[PDB]
């Protein structure tokens, strides 16, 4: 067995023994001395020592008698110093022998007290003994005091006289150490398990289970409770807490050195006082501060706060070294300084290739400094290292030639701050260019958030062959042409390149040279650059296009095409294996991006990279040839701008007449006036797109006018190069409406555009949105950056383990349709996904579509003709793969062109794919197909106005076509108006059902007058404004905001006839009195007659924070109520306006009841057969409620759809596979129902229980089948439950984790990615994954 090999695999943490501290130590620190004032050297036996810790000089003694590297490991007889290197002062430690036992602060003050839970004693009782105020009973017999009893000095005196001798009680920290000495761990666990048999409890059970979990973990590791109180105190090495002379001459010392002195000082005094007369008052006080001295040394920010001897600052304690945002544990990742690194301002590089960057000459000479010396002595140009150093410094002409040789074929990484996704660091092969600025490729600039105006980039250089290869094979820009977030390419031409291809492809009416036959695309270049024909005009060209063959490649179709001169030249740029139809159209940013996407799957990776550069070179050349210029005349104002404004300007003054008269109220005016300017702003914008969009008119050939305008501004907007249609609105047409500091919109918008001079008032108005929008942007990076940090820490420790997981189960995927519009088709949704079950849809004759296969970009085209719906594909959620993803049962790699290879970290990509683009962050049923409306469970009643309002809780809508079959299915809620009844023919494009989306109306049954009984104004009801009908309406307040005068009053509307007597409700002889709940808004007045079907009262129900809320699994303000057990369910009893739901099935036992709030409107009336997971209260659904009842599938698709809806509105494309990775990290950790091996509640992983259930049911001597229920933990609730203390203390609170690891005796085997970064080992992901498998396999055998 190896003994001296430092190659470790696992690290463990436990409590240190007083004898174990002496093993670390090499001597005892007895003096508080440091350094002499005369000669700057260590003193005798102080903090700084050469006899204990090591010599200050390299291989020398203190006196200077022993010199030269001759002597090694020689213990001096004159001084006592070992002749060794001074690095020994960094590793060697010391010890301080304490005269009195002092308690540890980490186990005492840190909640919920490690010493307190172990002894079953509150902190108030422990501290009063420790601090020396009261005695505590340790040993018990027949002394009436039993155990842990707190006794004062006057109580202890009388108790000893009555008994004594056999009775044992001590005072101070000595008593606590003796109390932990006497306790038996083997017998305490047996007693607690016996009492948890008859009296179990529910809420008080948690503290009883906490004690067992603390005691059982204490014995299995073997820490011993006696070491909780410190007797020997370890000392840090002198190098970590140094006294170094600065440049000026004044010394600089650590705050730890000042703390250590105030420990030894009173330690030496206590050793004196114990033999030089010991009065209790002084001795207890010296022990009082000595306990505080260690407390201030370990963790200063707990008991009091120590002040530095010279400075007015809290001293950096031993705990403060690890934590504090920037310490030692947290600087392993963030605060890491790196050699072989550069930094300069970025510049454009149009002459460079995609794999090439323009690295500065003087920077590269400095960076590859050791690389120059290596290939200079090898060439025979320089004699030695020092001679090679002189040649570099003198800047010799021959050095520049060798420099280029080393840089060639050597990749260099380029990093930009901040890195949101992985493409922020890309490798490039440098080309030497003279200058102090670094040149970057224009195409890869789209990957970063970079702009050539004042941005800087870090220049990193790999050193080893392994580092050079993983930069070329993985981190190279040519290899990373696609984005990891979505299947669309990230390297897409922008600005100048788009404008160049747009002008080249666009056509004119009659340009120079039209109607020629042209021999090949070569003659198209012959006419333009010579000066005989323009790029525009429709001219026939002979072209030879090559289509893809079934085997490839023999198809060569030649035909005459009707294009332009410019389109023919661009075909030469287009590779052979691509159709001509893709370049035939006028190309913009939307069209050019489609060229690279099609070129990738059809040809490969290599052909599209060369093509990508070829577009860029040609893009800049023809953009320069065109000469696009933004002029003041190009900013065309609509012909009748002020004419439209004047029609809407005094139209506001027309409603100002209604403001004073009383036709339109003051509250209704503001929202009516604003609609005029909103319509006027759109009218000017639409009129702007006539004098700018197609304004040409002058045509030489014929008399026509139809042509796309050659305006410089429109060319930048139509192509999508720079500036959208929204930007052109403000400059030429109208700026629009601005906001107020409160949030409301200003009455009069800015009429003046940027073409004309803005007013002083108008410009001050526009500044508010400028200093508010940019203020949001200043904290947008901080908020989205924390969101990126949040998603990583929970999913980072997730890598691909197996090639295929043995489950034919996944998620049902349907194209997202909102109301009657398709957002994303099946092709874009199921692209990349691997199917779990074969396609069984009938349409065209075939022999089945194979399962467990990758859906290609060409394979998905076959599914489009057949029109397939609802395909269950293998996803990240449904995985039984030990600890990770199962490759095949996941999907394609979006950056690559095939399946994702095993070893790649999915969770890190999944977190970056959402955090990066995060910076940019139904009501009426309409039918198109002709048929007939058939209704079931109809309870409609016609009112006085003429609205068919239904008086039923559950209503469904169905359509019957020509043949006689159901077409569409839609749900109709309570309080809805139907257009047509049962069996009525509908036309193509007609609304059949209509209701207000954000309200819950209450419908009456009996007709007559309305009485306001117990409806006193001011006491129960208040007046405001309803924002739906609307006007002034009564608002009913809940039982919380009501006055002290009207305490017992029920808000209810009473229905009477013409005489004044109550009209009875059909069924019961009870008077008609509809009790109205809280929050409800009453629209009706006193004395107003209503018919059957009239509404009495209506009951009311962001961006980045919404995404953060869904991922954190936080319950909404108004959670939806759902039925838990299926069967015959009926209501029970009444209170005021609330119902207690009693759910009882048919079978045995089944005791269940529920309590529901009063204001809630239900979807069931009386005696209803309800199933598991049904909507009772309409609105938002609670994330925990869906998992509880609907299952572990409907909740997973709920997280996907709700998050995507936020990104769809903003215009962001993120795949559904990235979200479901984090969902799997939310579903982990489950609660056990059936008794297995340990407890009932606890916290065990889903797969940890799946390994358990597979082992218990067959072998392992258990035979019990542990039933488990899935639990949901939103990121931060799941990231705390990591099975590593090194990974936890990285982002979590350090002092809590290190104490928990010490007590339990945890072992970190280093499997997570974050665990190996801190220790300085290879990552169990990617290249290091194949390395890591070699060591994990040899743990079982050996």
């Amino acid at each position: 067995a190896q003994t001296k090999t430092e190659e470790f695999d696992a690290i463990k943490i436990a409590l240190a023994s007083p004898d174990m501290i002496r093993s670390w130590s090499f001597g005892e620190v007895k003096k508080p001395e440091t350094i002499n004032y005369r000669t700057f050297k260590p003193e005798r036996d102080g903090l700084f020592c050469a006899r204990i810790f090591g010599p200050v000089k390299d291989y020398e003694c203190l006196c200077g008698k022993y010199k030269r590297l001759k002597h090694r490991g020689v213990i001096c007889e004159k001084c006592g110093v070992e002749v060794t290197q001074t690095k020994v002062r960094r590793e060697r430690m010391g010890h301080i022998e304490l005269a009195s036992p002092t308690a540890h602060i980490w186990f005492l003050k840190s909640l919920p007290s490690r010493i307190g839970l172990l002894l079953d004693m509150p902190l108030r009782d422990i501290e009063r003994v420790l601090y020396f105020e009261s005695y505590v009973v340790i040993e018990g017999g027949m002394t009436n005091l039993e155990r842990q009893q707190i006794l004062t000095e006057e109580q202890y005196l009388d108790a000893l006289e009555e008994f004594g001798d056999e009775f044992d009680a001590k005072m101070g920290a000595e008593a606590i150490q003796a109390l932990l000495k006497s306790m038996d761990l083997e017998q305490e666990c047996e007693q607690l398990r016996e009492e948890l048999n008859e009296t179990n409890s529910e809420t008080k059970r948690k503290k009883l289970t906490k004690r067992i979990k603390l005691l059982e973990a204490f014995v299995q590791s073997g820490n011993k409770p006696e070491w909780m109180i410190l007797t020997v105190l370890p000392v840090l090495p002198p190098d970590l807490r140094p006294l170094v002379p600065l440049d000026g001459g004044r010394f600089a010392t650590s705050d730890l050195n000042d703390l250590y002195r105030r420990v030894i000082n009173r330690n030496n005094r206590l050793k004196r006082l114990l033999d030089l007369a010991a009065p209790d008052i002084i001795v207890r006080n010296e022990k009082r501060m000595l306990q505080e001295a260690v407390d201030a040394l370990l963790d200063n920010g707990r008991r009091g706060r120590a002040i530095t001897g010279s400075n007015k600052r809290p001293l950096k304690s031993l705990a403060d070294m690890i934590k504090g945002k920037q310490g030692r544990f947290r600087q392993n990742l963030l605060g890491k300084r790196v050699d072989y690194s550069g930094r300069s301002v970025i510049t454009v590089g149009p002459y460079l290739r995609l794999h090439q960057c323009g690295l500065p000459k003087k920077m590269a000479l400095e960076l590859f400094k050791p690389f120059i010396y290596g290939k200079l002595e090898l060439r025979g140009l320089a004699t030695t290292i020092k001679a090679a150093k002189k040649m570099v410094e003198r800047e010799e002409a021959v050095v520049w030639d060798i420099l280029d040789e080393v840089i060639r074929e050597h990749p260099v990484l380029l990093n930009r701050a901040p890195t949101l996704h992985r493409l922020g660091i890309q490798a490039f092969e440098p080309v030497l260019i003279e200058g102090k600025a670094i040149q970057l490729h224009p195409l890869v600039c789209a990957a970063y958030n970079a702009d050539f105006d004042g941005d800087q980039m870090a220049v990193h250089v790999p050193l080893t062959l392994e580092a050079q290869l993983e930069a070329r094979a993985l981190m190279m820009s040519t290899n990373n042409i696609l984005s990891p977030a979505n299947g669309e390419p990230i390297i897409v031409p922008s600005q100048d390149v788009v404008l160049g291809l747009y002008y080249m492809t666009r056509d004119c009416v009659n340009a120079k040279g039209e109607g020629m036959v042209l021999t090949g695309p070569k003659e198209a270049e012959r006419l333009y650059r010579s000066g005989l024909a323009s790029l525009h005009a429709r001219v026939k060209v002979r072209i030879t296009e090559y289509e893809k063959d079934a085997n490839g490649e023999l198809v060569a179709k030649t035909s005459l095409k009707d294009t332009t001169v410019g389109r023919a030249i661009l075909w030469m740029i287009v590779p052979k294996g691509l159709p001509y139809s893709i370049v035939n159209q006028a190309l913009g940013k939307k069209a050019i991006s489609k060229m690279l996407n099609t070129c990738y799957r059809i040809l490969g990776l290599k052909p599209t990279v060369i093509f990508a550069d070829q577009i860029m070179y040609t893009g800049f050349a023809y953009a320069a040839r065109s000469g696009a210029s933004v002029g003041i005349d190009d900013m065309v104002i609509p012909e009748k701008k002020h004419e439209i404004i004047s029609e809407a300007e005094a139209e506001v003054a027309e409603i100002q007449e209604q403001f004073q008269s009383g036709l339109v109220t003051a509250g209704e005016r503001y929202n009516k006036v604003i609609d005029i300017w909103a319509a006027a702003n759109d009218r000017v914008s639409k009129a702007m797109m006539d004098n700018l969009q197609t304004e040409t008119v002058i045509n030489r050939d014929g008399q026509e006018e139809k042509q796309v305008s050659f305006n410089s501004i429109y060319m930048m907007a139509d192509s999508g190069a720079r500036g959208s249609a929204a930007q052109i609105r403000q400059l030429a047409g109208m700026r629009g409406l601005m906001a107020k500091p409160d949030g409301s919109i200003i009455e009069t918008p800015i009429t003046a555009n940027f073409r004309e001079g803005l007013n002083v008032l108008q410009y001050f108005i526009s500044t508010h949105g400028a200093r508010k929008g940019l203020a949001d942007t200043a904290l947008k990076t901080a908020n989205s950056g924390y969101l990126t940090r949040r998603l990583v820490d929970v999913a980072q420790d997730l890598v691909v383990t197996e090639d295929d997981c043995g489950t034919h189960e996944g998620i049902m995927m349907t194209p997202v349709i909102e109301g009657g519009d398709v957002k994303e088709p099946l092709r874009d949704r199921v692209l990349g996904r691997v199917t779990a079950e074969d396609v069984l849809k009938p349409g065209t004759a075939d022999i089945l579509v194979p399962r467990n296969t990758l859906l290609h970009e060409q394979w998905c085209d076959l599914l489009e003709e057949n029109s397939v719906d609802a395909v269950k594909v293998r996803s990240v959620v449904s995985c039984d793969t030990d600890f990770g993803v199962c490759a095949h049962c996941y999907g394609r790699d979006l950056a690559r062109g095939h399946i994702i290879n095993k070893g790649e970290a999915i969770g890190v990509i999944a977190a970056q794919s959402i955090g990066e683009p995060g910076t940019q962050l139904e009501s009426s049923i309409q039918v198109k197909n002709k048929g007939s409306i058939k209704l079931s469970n109809v309870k409609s009643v016609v009112n006085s106005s003429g609205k068919l309002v239904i008086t039923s809780r559950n209503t469904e809508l169905k359509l019957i076509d020509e043949f006689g079959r159901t077409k569409e299915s839609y749900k109709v809620p309570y309080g809805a108006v139907l257009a047509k009844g049962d069996g009525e023919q509908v036309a193509g494009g007609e609304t059949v059902a209509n209701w207000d989306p954000h309200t819950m109306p209450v419908i009456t049954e009996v007709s007559g007058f309305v009485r306001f009984t117990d409806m006193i104004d001011g006491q129960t009801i208040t007046r405001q404004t309803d924002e739906l009908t609307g006007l002034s309406s009564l608002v009913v307040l809940d039982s919380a905001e009501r006055t002290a005068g009207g305490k017992d009053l029920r808000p209810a509307l009473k229905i009477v006839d013409a005489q004044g007597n109550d009209v009875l409700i059909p069924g019961t002889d009870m008077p008609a009195q509809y009790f109205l709940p809280g929050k409800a808004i009453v629209q009706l007045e006193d004395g107003v007659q209503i018919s059957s079907g009239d509404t009495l009262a209506r009951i009311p129900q962001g961006g980045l924070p919404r995404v953060a809320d869904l991922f954190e699994a936080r319950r909404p303000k108004e959670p939806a109520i759902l039925a838990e057990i299926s069967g015959i369910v009926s209501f029970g009893k009444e209170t005021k306006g609330k119902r207690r739901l009693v759910i009882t099935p048919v079978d045995g036992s089944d005791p269940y009841e529920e309590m529901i709030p009063k204001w809630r409107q239900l979807n069931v009336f009386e005696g209803e057969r309800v199933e598991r997971g049904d909507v009772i209260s309409d609105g938002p659904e609670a994330p925990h409620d869906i998992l509880r009842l609907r299952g572990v599938h409907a909740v997973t698709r709920y997280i996907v759809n709700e998050v995507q809806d936020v990104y769809r509105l903003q215009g962001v494309k993120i795949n559904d596979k990235h979200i479901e990775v984090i969902v799997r990290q939310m579903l982990r950790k489950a609660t056990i129902v059936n008794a297995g091996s340990s407890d009932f509640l606890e916290g065990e992983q889903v797969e940890y229980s799946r390994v358990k259930i597979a082992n218990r049911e067959l072998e392992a001597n258990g035979k019990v089948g542990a039933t488990y229920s899935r639990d949901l933990l939103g990121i931060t609730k799941a990231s705390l439950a990591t099975e590593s203390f090194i990974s936890a203390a990285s982002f979590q609170e350090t002092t809590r984790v290190l104490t928990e690891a010490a007590v339990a005796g945890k072992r970190d085997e280093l499997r997570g990615l974050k665990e190996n970064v801190i220790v300085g080992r290879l990552i169990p992901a990617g290249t290091g994954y194949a390395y890591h498998q070699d060591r994990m396999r040899r743990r079982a055998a050996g």
Binding site: E33, E133, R261, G304
Partner: protein, 481 residues
């Protein structure tokens, strides 16, 4: 803060005793010490030890300090004169032999012998010992007590437990006799079941009594006389120590009044009181009730002495001596004077004139007086950085220089290989190349077959060939350093 509050509440219960109340405690202190001094005078070995240790220093010629200052200090019933030192220890030796013949005759302390033992104690009480020498005299009775009761416990172990014997019969037998063997063998004569089964361990019980009865010949007192003094000595020690506690406890409030003034210096507030309490320990031990003056005035000097000594010894990181501390305090007093009397600032040329010290002394102390700066001192903040972050390490050698050292040893090895066989061995010994030890010209000559003078010739011959530009072009590149 917690520790400051309750300390004031612990001594708050103890009330101050003044005037004649102080004397009541002070009388028990001096009577407590005197009772111990009576116990030392009764002990026969203490008289022998005082005569034995006297000849240890007197034989080594006439001295003044160190050991003699610990002894003598006489009081009839500072530099000690040799005339009196020889005189006082003279009658003590005479009383040692005259009070011995009466002990041998008849009983131990028989009438006339009792009169002379009391006369012998009067001569011993004449001397006063310094704590350094006084402690070992008490240890001559403390350690010897752990030899009487320990051996009696061994006798009790192998008779009461081993033979299973009642404890009632042990009282009369092991008190009235003690010395003779008329308790061990006399119990068997009565003939009893638990008395006859004592022969199994008879070779350990009364045999171990030779480490108990020998003490009677070693010291000079019987078992009855040994226990009578040792138990009485523990009384006087408990009398003084416990009474000294009451004097300290009552005067704890006086310590705080002085400690509050020296708070702004360096040390913590509670450290001043705890050290001041140690100063109060000295203010009771040296205090007498025969003084006839206020206790508060005498205590203030001793409390202040403990604070002032510790405030310069500790507090600072680097320790500054007592003499150097006084000059730093002198600097600050004149700095306040010269700043406003002249106008601007005191220069080293002008500051040295009033201090009566040379310029090289003042300008040296100014650097030493400065306290070492904290490691975590914030400089500008913004991106959050400390003073300890910008400090570079000069101990580490450059990786370029580390490669140069490796290249130099590799180059010289090829250089020495070009030399003619024996030429390489000489240079590797003369300069210690690739060898652990460096050799001198005389050492090579005797271990290389050749003469002494020849070594100097071939050394320069080996150097000359390496001084040539054609051969050593690689070695000339290292000359840049």
């Amino acid at each position: 803060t917690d520790p400051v509050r309750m300390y004031m509440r612990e001594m708050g219960t103890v009330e101050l005793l003044t005037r004649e109340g102080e004397i009541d405690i002070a009388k028990r202190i001096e009577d407590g010490i005197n009772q111990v001094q009576c116990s030392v005078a009764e002990y026969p070995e203490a008289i022998t030890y005082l005569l034995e240790q006297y000849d240890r220093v007197e034989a080594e010629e006439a001295r003044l300090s160190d050991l003699i200052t610990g002894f003598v200090d006489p009081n009839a019933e500072n530099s000690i004169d040799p005339e009196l030192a020889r005189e006082k220890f003279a009658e003590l030796r005479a009383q040692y032999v005259v009070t011995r013949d009466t002990i041998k005759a008849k009983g131990r302390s028989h009438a006339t012998a009792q009169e002379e033992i009391l006369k012998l104690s009067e001569v011993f009480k004449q001397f006063r010992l310094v704590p350094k020498q006084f402690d070992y005299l008490v240890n001559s009775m403390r350690v010897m007590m752990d030899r009487v009761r320990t051996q009696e416990r061994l006798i009790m172990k192998l008779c009461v437990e081993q033979c299973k014997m009642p404890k009632k019969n042990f009282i009369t037998l092991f008190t009235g006799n003690e010395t003779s063997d008329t308790w061990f063998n006399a119990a068997i004569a009565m003939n009893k079941p638990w008395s006859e089964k004592l022969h199994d361990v008879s070779e350990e019980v009364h045999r171990a009594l030779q480490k108990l009865q020998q003490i009677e010949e070693e010291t000079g007192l019987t078992i009855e006389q040994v226990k009578d003094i040792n138990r009485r000595m523990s009384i006087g020690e408990a009398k003084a120590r416990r009474a000294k506690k009451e004097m300290v406890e009552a005067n704890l409030r006086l310590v705080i009044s002085i400690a509050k003034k020296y708070t702004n210096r360096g040390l913590q507030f509670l450290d001043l009181i705890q050290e001041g309490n140690i100063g109060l320990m000295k203010a009771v031990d040296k205090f007498e009730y025969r003084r006839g003056y206020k206790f508060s005035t005498y205590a203030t000097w001793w409390i202040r002495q403990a604070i002032t000594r510790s405030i310069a010894d500790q507090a600072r990181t680097i320790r500054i001596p007592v003499h150097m501390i006084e000059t730093i305090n002198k600097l600050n007093r004149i700095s306040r004077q010269m700043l406003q009397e002249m106008g601007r600032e005191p220069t080293p040329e002008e500051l040295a004139e009033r201090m009566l010290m040379p310029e090289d002394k003042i300008r040296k102390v100014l650097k030493i007086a400065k306290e070492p700066i904290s490691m975590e001192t914030p400089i500008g903040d913004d991106e959050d950085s400390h003073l300890g972050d910008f400090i570079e390490d000069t101990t580490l050698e450059l990786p370029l220089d580390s490669a140069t050292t490796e290249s130099l040893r590799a180059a010289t090895h090829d250089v020495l290989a070009g030399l003619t066989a024996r030429e390489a061995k000489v240079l590797r010994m003369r300069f210690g190349i690739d060898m652990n030890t460096d050799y001198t010209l005389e050492e090579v000559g005797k271990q290389f077959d050749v003469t002494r003078e020849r070594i100097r010739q071939i050394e320069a011959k080996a150097l000359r060939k390496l001084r040539h530009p054609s051969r050593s072009e690689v070695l000339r590149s290292f000359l840049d350093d």
